[PDB]
Amino acid sequence: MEFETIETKKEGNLFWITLNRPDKLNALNAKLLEELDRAVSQAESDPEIRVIIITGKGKAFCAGADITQFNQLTPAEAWKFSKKGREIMDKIEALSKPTIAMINGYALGGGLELALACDIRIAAEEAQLGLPEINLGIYPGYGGTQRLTRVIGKGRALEMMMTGDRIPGKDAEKYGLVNRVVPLANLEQETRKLAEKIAKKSPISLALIKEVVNRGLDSPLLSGLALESVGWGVVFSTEDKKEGVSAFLEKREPTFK
Amino acid sequence: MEFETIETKKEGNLFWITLNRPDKLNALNAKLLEELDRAVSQAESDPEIRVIIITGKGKAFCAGADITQFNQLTPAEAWKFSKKGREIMDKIEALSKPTIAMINGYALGGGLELALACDIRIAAEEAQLGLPEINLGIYPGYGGTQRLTRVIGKGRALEMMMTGDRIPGKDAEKYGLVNRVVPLANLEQETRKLAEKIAKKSPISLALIKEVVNRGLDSPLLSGLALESVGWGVVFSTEDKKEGVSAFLEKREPTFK
Amino acid sequence: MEFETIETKKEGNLFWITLNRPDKLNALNAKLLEELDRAVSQAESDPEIRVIIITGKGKAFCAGADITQFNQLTPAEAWKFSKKGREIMDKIEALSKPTIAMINGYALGGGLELALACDIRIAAEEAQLGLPEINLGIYPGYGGTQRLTRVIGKGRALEMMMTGDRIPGKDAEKYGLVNRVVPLANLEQETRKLAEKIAKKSPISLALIKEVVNRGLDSPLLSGLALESVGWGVVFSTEDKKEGVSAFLEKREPTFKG
Amino acid sequence: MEFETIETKKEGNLFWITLNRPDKLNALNAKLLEELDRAVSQAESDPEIRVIIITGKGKAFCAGADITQFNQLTPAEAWKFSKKGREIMDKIEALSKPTIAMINGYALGGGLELALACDIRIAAEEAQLGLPEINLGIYPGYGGTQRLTRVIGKGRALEMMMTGDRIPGKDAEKYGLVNRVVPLANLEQETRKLAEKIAKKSPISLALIKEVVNRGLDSPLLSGLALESVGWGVVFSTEDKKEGVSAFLEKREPTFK
Amino acid sequence: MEFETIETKKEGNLFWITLNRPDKLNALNAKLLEELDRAVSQAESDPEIRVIIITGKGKAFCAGADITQFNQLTPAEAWKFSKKGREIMDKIEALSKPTIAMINGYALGGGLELALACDIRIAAEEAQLGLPEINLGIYPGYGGTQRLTRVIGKGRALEMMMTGDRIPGKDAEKYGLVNRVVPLANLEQETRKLAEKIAKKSPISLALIKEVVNRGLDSPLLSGLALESVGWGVVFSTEDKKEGVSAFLEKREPTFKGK
Amino acid sequence: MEFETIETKKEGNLFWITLNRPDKLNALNAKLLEELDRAVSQAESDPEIRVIIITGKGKAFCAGADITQFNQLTPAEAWKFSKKGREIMDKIEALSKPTIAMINGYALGGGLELALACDIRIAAEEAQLGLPEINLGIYPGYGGTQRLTRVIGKGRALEMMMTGDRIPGKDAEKYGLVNRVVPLANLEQETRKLAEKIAKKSPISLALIKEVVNRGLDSPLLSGLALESVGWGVVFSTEDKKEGVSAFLEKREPTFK
Ligand SMILES: CC(C)(COP(=O)(O)OP(=O)(O)OC[C@H]1O[C@@H](n2cnc3c(N)ncnc32)[C@H](O)[C@@H]1OP(=O)(O)O)[C@@H](O)C(=O)NCCC(=O)NCCS
Ligand SMILES: CC(C)(COP(=O)(O)OP(=O)(O)OC[C@H]1O[C@@H](n2cnc3c(N)ncnc32)[C@H](O)[C@@H]1OP(=O)(O)O)[C@@H](O)C(=O)NCCC(=O)NCCS
Ligand SMILES: CC(C)(COP(=O)(O)OP(=O)(O)OC[C@H]1O[C@@H](n2cnc3c(N)ncnc32)[C@H](O)[C@@H]1OP(=O)(O)O)[C@@H](O)C(=O)NCCC(=O)NCCS
Ligand SMILES: CC(C)(COP(=O)(O)OP(=O)(O)OC[C@H]1O[C@@H](n2cnc3c(N)ncnc32)[C@H](O)[C@@H]1OP(=O)(O)O)[C@@H](O)C(=O)NCCC(=O)NCCS
């Protein structure tokens, strides 16, 4: 309910998670990652919640991992540290409920890596995005080497990771790093409209779409197609499917409960 | 050569398959899938045919699939239903001859899934594309969860499948969902020009290209590269290679029989 | 360092490899492939070199490959010839040091395949890229069928391979085949700028980024992620990491000496 | 349903396909492969058939592909010939009904590839198995390079393919190439006993087991697991599940109608 | 630390988890899974623990998933139920510390799937193992369709899942389903011997071995090899490596402390 | 021709590589690895050589990497060291000519990893095999964690790697770690017999089998099968295939030139 480093708001079917360390530009530290994990678990457990939005308080969405940790890591501890925080990102990606990253400002390092773990990214024009970990003599340790490459392609991902350069929102849109950009002033509203569209749909169909997409993409195409087919069987069994098929024939809007 | 729900036309080495249920916006039903399957096998079997083109009659390319069994399908029958329909799409994808989807209008749900099975998509500016299965409380069941994701990336494919929203032709082109958009008035001409270029080329080279590209993409890069090299040996044995090489060396336009 | 078909130039920590057969539009032949292999081996061996840039002399980056032998190859010999040339491309892709293809002109057939093996591509607006092998009754045999498809997607790669038509640099940028295009007049300057930015960074971190990205991309995502995490432990053992973390805490600019 | 090179017999819910070219040791020619394809399709569509068993007439199971075809083919035709035959094997492997190869004798080259395509292999002690294609200056072309390697491991597979040496049934059992070996005199009864036990189970459960095993094995373990879980949801909607669960609850034998 | 359905015992470096529902042959119910989960998380958290052993009290290791659950589930609920239970098995498989299944008797369905999630299996000759889920009109839903097939091969895994027939310990050993079998009377001794050998090794090296083997097996061979190499970097940073290499050069016995 | 740490002998078609550091049980130092690489590359390039055999001088096959190298390595140097040595193993594995490891005695750590890189392993009953790296506070770094677990299975491989314990020849054979075990006194003759058999066969066919098997095993099955088919194309172009098929048809022994 109440957290040191984040704020949570339940708004009907919408769960809003705001990173709340604005003095440190929402830098991810051990506590914030622990709290973000809990919040996301809360949301997944609570059947009122249908869509989760992550955003940042103030100027930054997230400026990265908290560097103060780093000077006292053994290599073996560094491995475990990277794996631990990255596993929080992996949980978010595998969530059975849709997730949106609303990028209001800087999304750098750990910050962009969190955004990459969400299903959909919507950014402000004023947002700046990057993986500046190479500037510290290291490299992205929260999934960025895998997720950025897959999203914008190897050449652009390598140039961003090797130089550490930030790109503007409009460039992120161009490369497909974010689904679209809008002025900061329109961001909350554009995000709310998307989330509310999704929050109307069948929770079970949404969970199956995510499972089938995520698991299928990692597999050979025939194995992903087989997963899609078997899952279609499961969705077909549901009350929301019945509601949906009957709303269509009766020319009304379905209520997917 | 004579069908209830489709029309076929052989023009030289071009084979045109037109979905023909314009009153239902060319919606896919049991009968249409069965005929499409037969038409494609004939085209693949006919040695005069070098390129296949699939398009729709009327306002739509294909606006969806019939919902008329969905009341008498058990979950297990729904699994087999999904698989049976999708496997026809897989057969088009795996044809030894180039296929082009000429998207003249709505390409929605099953219809977009069919277009995604073709090698190349050319669309009309006026075309609308999407996967609205979520609106019925189900999800795409003819390969959309796998092929859309792979073509436009996960962020945009998830947004499209979770909202059900249609996108105009020009957005499809921006996202790489179609190769080109042109005004509907120039669609048949643009398509024909492409088809005619490909039909000039060695059928055996085209067949090997499709095999190594499709099979190689699903493998580790070194395995796909090994497939490319061994196929290169095969294409080097061909009559069209001898013609092609000696045509260039003797400064002459080659004829590929 | 004295080669027949290529020129090599060491400029600080930058190594420039220029294909040098302008009369034949820098066409790849057995000799050029052999020298390029040797030059790239040299660059990788030399600890003063941080970044390798490949480019072409004259109007072409690389306009194709030598077709002279093609009418005298057996199918089994053709398989081996394909494998031999392509393995030099694979070697460039797997290099421990960042590679940039500076595409100044025609990049066709083998020439596009060479560019595809580099980490990053920067092209002139004037450049034209294509795989016209289909026009000889064959198909790309130095990795194009795999690499182009992965880069610009199946639909556009198949159209390019099936028709054999070239695309302008602006289209290549739109498809993601190159990172960006600039006017040819500004191409060297823009490439040097990128190379110099990369050459300032930790060589061990750059080597780890390439290994993790290349190997991770070929695996299921969890396996790529596991590779990224273990690699992070290796990057934390370096002096460059100590320097970079120091520098950030002391609000000063790091110097990555290696 | 009446064939030249094969005999088909339906015994209750068992479908027996017996290769019938005893003079040529059941060697696979274009006609046999054509008829085998038609026979398996026939069995799969017939809802009375639950289990398919493939065996050979006379002393051999199958002594390979027919070598009289080989010296006619160009290299491009040889690629298409390999693909054509092997795709029939693939279809057998992908069948929604359980398949058993009853290896009564010689299973060499194409014949071993045919056996590898089935779900389960039972052989006679007297059976000899191998891939002697290298003795013709070629190598296995109907899947042996892939299926044998996966079944008996690379070391033993490479030794067999590089030497062309045959192994006895007992060695095949030891290496896991067959499930069981029994004297030829007991082979039909051992096979019948296995087929009858399988024929009693839920056909839908058996179809889902095969799909999730075959597709799952080809995927990353998490994708295979996800496929197993969605399939479990489909199997829970079946009438045979209701029967089976109540039978354990009621301490009575179940009947899978 | 005190559980309704399991017993946990911490003998030095070793953590023994014993399934404790002998009247129902250690059948997995929702409570047992929750408790097993907690116990495995505990052992994982605790640096004093180096090796985890799982076994069953009584006649059976584990006779299956509690079938009384299965009556009420909609297809969607059944999907979720499979995934939830199987995700616990996944967690055991992915644990950073070595796990041994000590299979003292019946390992059926859920029971065998639990065994398959452990790193190493040692069984009594007297043990019976199988996946009898097909007898209930269903199929293995806690990972058996994927893990059994990968361990004993597709032919025999299909035969086992399609027939539901159980196999004796010695057949399990022949197929590679267990590492070895010994008489039940020597089973605890054989298991302790193995566990104590592993427990004296570098914890960081063992954690890396498991990560590299598990992640590498699921990848193309070159990617797994890449992961092996980069991990070698990490293991060469440890105090235990210095000790081990020192000990060999000095022709003496190393003591690994896992700093 | 002449090396410091290995001996080589060319007998007809066979090339024998004998590790020659018997005072250190053939432990792999930088020098031995460099010379082994050079010898296998020479053998690959020499058209007279058809089969390569690797064996050890004295008591041992090979007792692993030379441990005197290890306390000089930094972590980043250790990464590099692993990759360098293992890439020599990779090269042996991918060689275009058949390789046999004749395991005369101890094959531990790097020695077992070297044996695992060869196509076929024949061991003496007296041979002891293992991966005792864990005994040194490290783990296998020349590919053992991947190759051993693919060959004998995860449970047996994890137990050997975690305990460091050695197994005798006969258990190696049980596990499929070696093809065959014979007494040391018969080992050279058993190895020679196998080698001479393989050296009779088509060099091009043997190269294609190795490429198709190694690359195919690493792929989804359908991609492996596609590779086998196109390769069959290439092997049908060879003089040796013409000789083999016409030899069989002409009822005579083939001579594979
Ligand atoms: C984002 C940026 C471009 C614009 O910020 P700016 O206007 O320079 O203001 P700062 O971000 O320096 O100031 C905000 C505070 O948060 C801190 N902060 C920012 N990112 C941080 C991180 N990843 N970890 C810990 N602290 C961080 C700053 O050091 C500063 O703290 P201080 O003023 O109390 O010392 C700038 O912060 C930048 O250079 N980023 C470096 C931060 C970073 O960690 N980059 C690597 C991410 S892996
Ligand atoms: C199978 C085996 C070793 C038995 O040998 P055997 O006991 O001497 O019996 P035969 O060789 O007389 O075989 C019986 C008949 O079947 C034929 N036959 C066997 N395998 C055949 C094949 N793969 N293709 C065509 N015909 C075949 C023989 O030519 C012979 O016919 P004939 O009596 O009209 O001349 C032997 O037949 C053999 O070597 N077959 C070839 C197997 C092979 O190469 N398979 C690879 C498939 S590409
Ligand atoms: C293991 C087995 C062969 C032992 O047979 P047995 O020695 O006659 O023992 P019982 O059948 O009396 O079983 C002992 C008790 O444990 C219970 N039990 C055993 N396995 C169970 C399971 N998977 N779910 C629920 N309860 C189970 C039995 O119902 C019985 O309960 P009761 O004594 O309160 O009536 C038998 O319990 C069995 O067949 N279980 C497997 C169930 C199955 O088909 N699949 C597993 C699904 S994951
Ligand atoms: C194989 C072994 C059991 C045989 O024992 P043995 O018959 O007593 O023979 P020794 O131990 O005396 O070995 C003979 C010589 O080879 C040396 N040697 C053996 N394996 C070696 C290795 N991997 N690296 C360096 N030297 C090695 C020994 O140190 C000894 O040298 P010395 O006589 O000059 O001191 C034992 O030598 C051994 O355990 N070796 C280490 C194996 C290993 O851990 N390999 C993996 C390393 S990464």
Author numbering:
A (entry chain E), B (entry chain F), D (entry chain B), F (entry chain A): 1 to 257
C (entry chain D): 1 to 258
E (entry chain C): 1 to 259
From the reporting publication:
To elucidate the molecular mechanism of Ms3HPCD, we purified, crystallized, and determined its crystal structure at a 1.8 Å resolution. The monomeric structure of Ms3HPCD consists of three distinct domains: One spiral domain and two trimerization domains. The asymmetric unit of the crystal contained six Ms3HPCD monomers, corresponding to a hexameric assembly. The hexamer is formed by dimerization of two trimers. Two glutamate residues (Glu113 and Glu133), which were known to act as catalytic acid and base, respectively, are positioned at the active site of Ms3HPCD. In the vicinity of the catalytic residues, Ala65 and Gly110 are positioned to form an oxyanion hole during enzyme catalysis. In our current structure, the CoA molecule is tightly bound at the substrate binding site, although we did not add the molecule during the protein expression and purification procedure, which enabled us to identify the CoA binding mode of the enzyme. The CoA binding site is formed between three domains, the SD and TD1 of one molecule (Mol I), and the TD2 of the neighboring molecule (Mol II). The pantothenic acid-moiety of CoA is tightly bound and buried in the pocket, whereas the 3′-phosphoadenosine moiety is partially exposed to the surface of Ms3HPCD. Four aromatic residues, such as Phe70, Phe81, Tyr142, and Trp232, play crucial roles in the formation of the unique small size pocket.
